[model samples]
Target: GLADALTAPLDHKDKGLQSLTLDQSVRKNEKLKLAAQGAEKTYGNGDSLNTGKLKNDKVSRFDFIRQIEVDGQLITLESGEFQVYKQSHSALTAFQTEQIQDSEHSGKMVAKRQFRIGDLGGEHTAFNQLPDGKAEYRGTAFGSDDAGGKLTYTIDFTKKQGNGKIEHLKSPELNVELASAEIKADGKSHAVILGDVRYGSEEKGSYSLGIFGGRAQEVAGSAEVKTVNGIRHIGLAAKQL
Candidate 1:
């Protein structure tokens, strides 16, 4: 007798639906409804489900959503193309970041700095005065009796520096030219050790520290030979790994 049935809005009067957890509702509704609709339309003869219609009823897809907090604010985002019920296979594993160690910082620069210092300041083993041939010690002669022909067992050291010209009524004597000095730092900031030594000479006489003299004498071959110079006369070696 009735060609059309009355349609009514959904009435959710049951408190159970409100009490149900999201997972339970999704299980009871979304997934279950979709699956039932999918099955029924696919196999049923009614227009609501037509399993034979691939474009309409056979369509199956999924999506995934995750939520995270950044700076105290919640944010939800999506991954790549996904399906709700299907498994996701990743091409690559997860990656992580790490802090670098202090030891690894500026490694090349430290090495280059070390190399440069070697050429500029090498280590010294003997006592040096003003340094041979240096602008500070030009035209200088060094060593005992001020003249080199000392037969005495005692060693003396003296050095002189000045122009070669005889304007001062004195002759000039010269020995080996000066080379660059090799220096090293001691425990003190201003203190350094001169690795090499050079003595200068005057014309016919030997120039000396006058006050400075002595050499570590080697008597044939002893078990050990101690240096004769005092503590002030020796240079220090630097720490190198």
Candidate 2:
């Protein structure tokens, strides 16, 4: 099934969930099970999937909860009520989230005092400078980057404000602009991505995210766009870039 094909061959262990390893020769694919749930259906990778048009195709929209190597990159996917192109990449990870358990730590912010130092951080990724009540993030963009062009963002933790832009995306032919980022401070704080596609008749499009590790080692979240074809959503989790 699609799910099985998407699972990492081995475990890359983490406190939240275990990540493992399989064959050394195979490309590295890491997997984790978060403490949150969504609209995913448990379809495995080995399960054969087919594609069609805006009307008959049923499998593509069933909350594809998986992802794999596509277009020579690792990305998340999601489609829409419009028309699905069903590219080589599937929308399996379209809206995937690495969530924390609510019952254990609900309504918690990435506490200001718990900031990490060099060795103080976890094993994921690292920050070039100490997160001294302030941060500036720069990293490669993902998710909707498939459309074309380079996407960039700006973050200033001290001010709690930021911005992002999509330049030169081909098909849409629009310079997408992100509104002020809505920063959510939590155990896994995320700077929520939002804004409008100024060129499209649709006006407002959906937003994804940019989340961080407890120690601020990495940042990630969603990046989705709406076009005449369909809505393509993907996310990014970046270390200090």
Best by lDDT: 2
The models' CA-based lDDT, in order, is: 0.17, 0.35
- Candidate 2 lDDT over 129-190, as tens digits, reads 22446454544333432423445666666665666655654545445665566555434432
Model 1 vs. true fold: TM: 0.14
Give one digit per residue, the lDDT tens place, for model 1 in 58-129.
Answer: 112212222234567533321111111000110000101111113444222121100000001111213433
Q: Provide C-alpha RMSD values for all models, in order.
A: 40.0, 17.0
User: Once superposed on the true structure, which residue ranges of model 2 sit more than 4 Å away at CA?
Assistant: 1-130, 133-136, 139-148, 172-175, 185-203, 215-217, 228-238
* Most accurate candidate by TM-score: 2
Return the TM-score for each candidate structure.
0.14, 0.40
